[PDB]
RNA sequence: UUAAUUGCGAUAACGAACGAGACCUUAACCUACUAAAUAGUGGUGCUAGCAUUUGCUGGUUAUCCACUUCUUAGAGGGACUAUCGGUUUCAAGCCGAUGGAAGUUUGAGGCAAUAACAGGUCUGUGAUGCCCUUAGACGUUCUGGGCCGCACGCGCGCUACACUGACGGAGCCAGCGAGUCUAACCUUGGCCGAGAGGUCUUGGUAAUCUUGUGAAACUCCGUCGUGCUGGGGAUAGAGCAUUGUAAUUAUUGCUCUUCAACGAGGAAUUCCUAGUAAGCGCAAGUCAUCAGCUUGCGUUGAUUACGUCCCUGCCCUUUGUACACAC
RNA sequence: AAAAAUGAUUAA
């Protein structure tokens, strides 16, 4: 049972990966605000960063926050088994990658534009705005799509 | 029965599509409530001062009477039990019951 | 507060539109010669005690 | 006088023996700890990253003591649980076979269990001795 | 409701007008008599017949019965 | 041999069989002492024979219980019914019956289920609904 | 050749077999015999054979296109309970005619008092043993050999 | 062949309860009239085989269901008899709807 | 008093309960004395129970449930709001905690507090709907003792559940607060204000 | 009076029949008979492993023996509202209590009358009349597509809106099933893999093996902290596998990522009286693969009411009718 | 003593 006494050096809301990560939330669930990182990826990155898991995202010093940024930037170079990522073996270069905050919807645009420019059925269904994963459309999913 | 004309069926379908979502409820929301999960010096002094004379001690009453989150309530409550200024009555997860010492 | 404690001595019958009310005869605890017929919502045995907010009304919906 | 692991609280026995293995430090952690989520039914890793393997090792060793022989699939059906399938109902999903297998394979490495020439994994004499030592200390905690 | 049917009523009435001296006021031996003085396909209907017979015998003891 | 008897206790589908014989006053259930029965929110139900009759006369007798079937609670009820039945059957067979009937008086004075199993039975389900009585939601128009 | 055998044995109480009666009546309808005569004849044969009750139902189209169903019955004929499976025997047969298909349903109550298998009487059929009424002697009149 | 032991086992499987019990009783009887020590007829739990199906041939009307059942009644008897008499018991006392299966156990 | 040695150790705390039954091994039912009349022989505080869990048959008769212990009667009505059907272990645990919170906020027997809350929360007069016309009316009627204690348990549990829904406070604590408020009469409790509203309506339809 | 055209009885009706009942199955009770390494328990009788003034386990029908309490199935017994207290045209009966396993016909079913519907089925039928078609076939097969298509409306449901919770670790518990030799079915166990899975053997034609289906809800101990939040998991992106010749219009499973409505729901409306409602899962049916469905099974287990004819209907009698295609 | 209108043609 640790009851820590600290001065006014608590770090309030902070910026990573062009995304607002706010303090007072545990570091794992604070990082999840960034697009492209979920609870599992946030937990794994936090644990590979050699930091405590009860630091409220406001006790993290700068240096251990650039360590966690670099771990997010290069997931493979920190002993991740590469089946854990978001984009494995892509069309362009076939290298296992993980997209981040501003790049997830960008790569989504690139893939959707590719499927449209190739006129594949999934791409044309996306262009029309229908369901692409094979759901029935007779009754369900009406008020918006 | 009476079949509707194609124009009437189209009008009904277009009306249904244009229809807004009629939420059948009164939606009342309370205001933002914040609790200082980080324990600074002034809040710690308030803890060490007014937690004694509390007839009832628990995570919920620590949250209500002091703007601290449940996590800080639990860890500080166990800290006070370590210091022994509160004695237990029923020990159980998800529900703590504590009163004054001696 | 003048709340009246009365002991039932007879259940007259089951009254009401849906049969949800009981016709009972109750005598008073303080004086057992003050019988009166009342309407009771819930289930009743004999020898049960009721509380009467007003102790002067006769129950309608007879026979 | 005589005491075995049947008269003690199972949960406190598991925790105390897990800490005893934690102090010995010979359980040869698999390496894929800090990654795995211990079951397909789960959706999160264990919240105790540094002791969940030790807790599983103690619980498995106790369970092997309880029964005659228990296999990896039987541990899988045991340690598995319900799985949330979104808009679908729940169903039972077995635990991680690799983790259950590795815990069992660690048990003979720390020497408690043997081949069990009839069946699966069964408790040895030295492992029995170590368990009733931790039983004695846990009873006189 | 435990209203006995006419098969039980008529079997009991004939048994009373046929073996009245042998019949005894308690149920158990009326049961153990009906197996020899009658042939009932089922134990259940035999017990029902014996129970109505012993109830009528209780009635017969304190005065006569019409029919 | 040694003076001994055996009984059983039954909830809905749980059964507990008790071997009751003279000794030094040793109580176990499923090879575990009865004080470890889980849950601890219902450990009182298996304590109740020990607290009603008075364990002073338990010094001579020892009981070993094996319980299977049903759920956890059904096992709790079958265990406590079996221990009560075994105690009063050991009294009937090997003790004077003044003590047998006074035990029966105290047992019936607290619960009838200590000696007589609940006659409530599961009701088989009928087509057209999820349960025996409940029906699927009827639809008009 | 020499181990598989087939033995054919004569049917006794041939009026009691609903299958035989149904086949014979169907052959009567094929031969052109009147429907009322065929049903009353088969009923008479069944009852004279010793069966407790008989039942012949002819459903189809008899005089006009519109359908109907005659019924011919005799004797005692229960409908519910285990004695249906114990004393009732039924047969159903289709009858091709120019106009269509006629269904012939035969139901037979065989007498429980006959046969040596199963119940020899209906359930609840209580029968009493005769008292064999005797005279009471007044005096004791002890006897010796 | 020289009047020795076989450790024979006989299984009776049938739906007809009475047609099963009669043969099993006769085998039991022939044991004592040939002073034969044995294990008595162990009766398996009566297997029931169910089929639940809609009564309607089409798909109209109230969704009424009907269930039909087999009952398989089984008895295994372990016999220890000489060679000249295991045939004496197996060729006789055979009933319709009842079959007999014989295995020379070695366990 | 005077514990005896046993071959299998029995804990000292449970050893003291041999003298008489002790609810949760923490309180005895002696000197409860439901003081407001007309609710006697309907609130069950005479037979002692070790715990609020006993699977007894209390539904096959009209008035059989009145012989079920009042604590278990309160417990069996906390097994709601649909998602909580079953889980009597959970309901019993909540009841144990709420009685502990009573015994720490007030130097009073929690059973005494519960029966006082029921006596103070059972409505004495209600209405019934009569008249098939469009303007249907209500007629005030008296309330039987059994319905009074049933409606009291219902209103206490319902108010505790609603106060527990979507707030930091545990159900055991908000039930204890409701029970403490009702056992004295403070009109800040759901069951008191609901009962007072209902009685006022019967007064207006008298 | 009964659930009953069930009876008491009255009687221009008498004696009869079907239905109801009776009957059969099934859940309960049997220290009573028969027994059982395909169900068991006990003797530790044989060796022992552990702790130590004695308990827990391993090998026990060739490493033995005894007994059916638990288990099963054969024949039975048991309840007949028994006894008692009340009440009655004192009759049929009904209400309480006492025993008993069981006292709403003990519970639940199976079967279930006469008469009818223009009810449904010609797409279950080598059941079928008539009409039509019959070689470029409305026959039968092969390839592909469709049956799933979406501005919309409706009916069954599943998951939810959370702290009586979610997540993590642990405790740890059913009953009904089913399952290969005319060939790959149910799968122990070992090894590899995060997982889904892959590979090598084993057992089971089955109370023997999967399987003690170690299911889930549940309980304890910790993380969260009233924030559409770590509640919810829709939509969508990328990859890894299994079935199948064939997976795109995504069979399904698995991993990571996206993380939408949804704050308890207007009018309205459904089901239910005790092991019932509800919660929770499991098995089976369809199945090569596919459950959010059904048929069963057990698990945890309420509240409220033992009533009335108010609504919606049913039965009997009397009555009115201009209805009989029958308000 | 609240309100309650209607129901196409032919087909024993
Ligand atoms: K259910
Ligand atoms: K085709
Ligand atoms: Mg589990
Ligand atoms: Mg019938
Ligand atoms: Mg379709
Ligand atoms: Mg979220
Ligand atoms: Mg379906
Ligand atoms: Mg009209
Ligand atoms: Mg008209």
From Swiss-Prot, chain A:
Belongs to the universal ribosomal protein uS13 family. Keywords: Acetylation, Cytoplasm, Isopeptide bond, Methylation, Ribonucleoprotein, Ribosomal protein, RNA-binding, rRNA-binding, Ubl conjugation. This is Small ribosomal subunit protein uS13A. One of its GO terms (biological process) is ribosomal subunit export from nucleus. The gene is RPS18A. N-terminally acetylated by acetyltransferase NatA. Component of the ribosome, a large ribonucleoprotein complex responsible for the synthesis of proteins in the cell. The small ribosomal subunit (SSU) binds messenger RNAs (mRNAs) and translates the encoded message by selecting cognate aminoacyl-transfer RNA (tRNA) molecules. The large subunit (LSU) contains the ribosomal catalytic site termed the peptidyl transferase center (PTC), which catalyzes the formation of peptide bonds, thereby polymerizing the amino acids delivered by tRNAs into a polypeptide chain. HAMAP family: Ribosomal_uS13 (MF_01315). InterPro entries: Rbsml_uS13_C, Ribosomal_uS13, Ribosomal_uS13-like_H2TH, Ribosomal_uS13_CS. Its main location: cytoplasm. Present with 48100 molecules/cell in log phase SD medium. There are 2 genes for uS13 in yeast. GO terms for cellular component: cytoplasm; cytosol; cytosolic small ribosomal subunit; mitochondrion; small ribosomal subunit. It is found in: Cytoplasm. The lineage of its organism: Eukaryota, Fungi, Dikarya, Ascomycota, Saccharomycotina. There is a cross-link at residues 35, 48, 79, 95 (Glycyl lysine isopeptide (Lys-Gly) (interchain with G-Cter in ubiquitin)). The modification N-acetylserine is found at residue 1. It comes from the Eukaryota. The modification N6-methyllysine is found at residue 47. SUPFAM superfamilies: S13-like H2TH domain.
Curated annotation (Swiss-Prot), chain D:
Component of the small ribosomal subunit (SSU). Mature yeast ribosomes consist of a small (40S) and a large (60S) subunit. The 40S small subunit contains 1 molecule of ribosomal RNA (18S rRNA) and 33 different proteins (encoded by 57 genes). The large 60S subunit contains 3 rRNA molecules (25S, 5.8S and 5S rRNA) and 46 different proteins (encoded by 81 genes). The lineage of its organism: Eukaryota, Fungi, Dikarya, Ascomycota, Saccharomycotina. PROSITE patterns: RIBOSOMAL_S19E. Disruption phenotype: Disruption of a single RPS19 gene reduces cell growth; a double disruption is lethal. Depletion experiments show the proteins are required for correct maturation of precursor rRNA to generate the 18S small rRNA. A specific site between the 18S and 5.8S precursors (site A2 in ETS1) is not cleaved in disruption mutants. Partially assembled ribosomes are retained in the nucleolus rather than being exported to the cytoplasm. All effects are exacerbated in the double disruption. Increases association of NOC4 with 20S/21S pre-rRNA, decreases association of ENP1, TSR1 and RIO2 with 20S/21S pre-rRNA. Present with 29000 molecules/cell in log phase SD medium. The gene is RPS19A. The keyword Cytoplasm applies. Changing residue 101 to E: Decreases mature 18S rRNA, protein binds 20S pre-RNA complex poorly. Lethal in double RPS19A/RPS19B mutant. SUPFAM superfamilies: Winged helix' DNA-binding domain. It is found in: Cytoplasm. Transmembrane segments: none annotated.
From Swiss-Prot, chain E:
It is found in: Cytoplasm. Component of the ribosome, a large ribonucleoprotein complex responsible for the synthesis of proteins in the cell. The small ribosomal subunit (SSU) binds messenger RNAs (mRNAs) and translates the encoded message by selecting cognate aminoacyl-transfer RNA (tRNA) molecules. The large subunit (LSU) contains the ribosomal catalytic site termed the peptidyl transferase center (PTC), which catalyzes the formation of peptide bonds, thereby polymerizing the amino acids delivered by tRNAs into a polypeptide chain. Component of the small ribosomal subunit (SSU). Mature yeast ribosomes consist of a small (40S) and a large (60S) subunit. The 40S small subunit contains 1 molecule of ribosomal RNA (18S rRNA) and 33 different proteins (encoded by 57 genes). The large 60S subunit contains 3 rRNA molecules (25S, 5.8S and 5S rRNA) and 46 different proteins (encoded by 81 genes). Belongs to the eukaryotic ribosomal protein eS17 family. Present with 30900 molecules/cell in log phase SD medium. There are 2 genes for eS17 in yeast. This is Small ribosomal subunit protein eS17A. The gene is RPS17A. The chain holds residues 2 to 68 of 136 of the full protein.
Curated annotation (Swiss-Prot), chain F:
PROSITE patterns: RIBOSOMAL_S9. It is found in: Cytoplasm. GO terms for cellular component: 90S preribosome; cytosol; cytosolic small ribosomal subunit. The modification Phosphothreonine is found at residue 68. Residues 121-141 are annotated as: Disordered. The keyword Cytoplasm applies. Residues 132-141 have a biased composition (Basic residues). Keywords: Acetylation, Cytoplasm, Isopeptide bond, Phosphoprotein, Ribonucleoprotein, Ribosomal protein, Ubl conjugation. The modification Phosphoserine is found at residues 32, 59, 74. InterPro entries: Ribosomal_Su5_D2-typ_SF, Ribosomal_uS9, Ribosomal_uS9_CS, Ribsml_uS5_D2-typ_fold_subgr. GO terms for biological process: maturation of SSU-rRNA from tricistronic rRNA transcript (SSU-rRNA, 5.8S rRNA, LSU-rRNA); translational initiation. GO terms for molecular function: RNA binding; structural constituent of ribosome. There is a cross-link at residues 28, 45, 57 (Glycyl lysine isopeptide (Lys-Gly) (interchain with G-Cter in ubiquitin)). Disulfide bonds: none annotated. Component of the ribosome, a large ribonucleoprotein complex responsible for the synthesis of proteins in the cell. The small ribosomal subunit (SSU) binds messenger RNAs (mRNAs) and translates the encoded message by selecting cognate aminoacyl-transfer RNA (tRNA) molecules. The large subunit (LSU) contains the ribosomal catalytic site termed the peptidyl transferase center (PTC), which catalyzes the formation of peptide bonds, thereby polymerizing the amino acids delivered by tRNAs into a polypeptide chain. Present with 33800 molecules/cell in log phase SD medium. Belongs to the universal ribosomal protein uS9 family. NCBIfam families: PRK00474.1. This is Small ribosomal subunit protein uS9A.
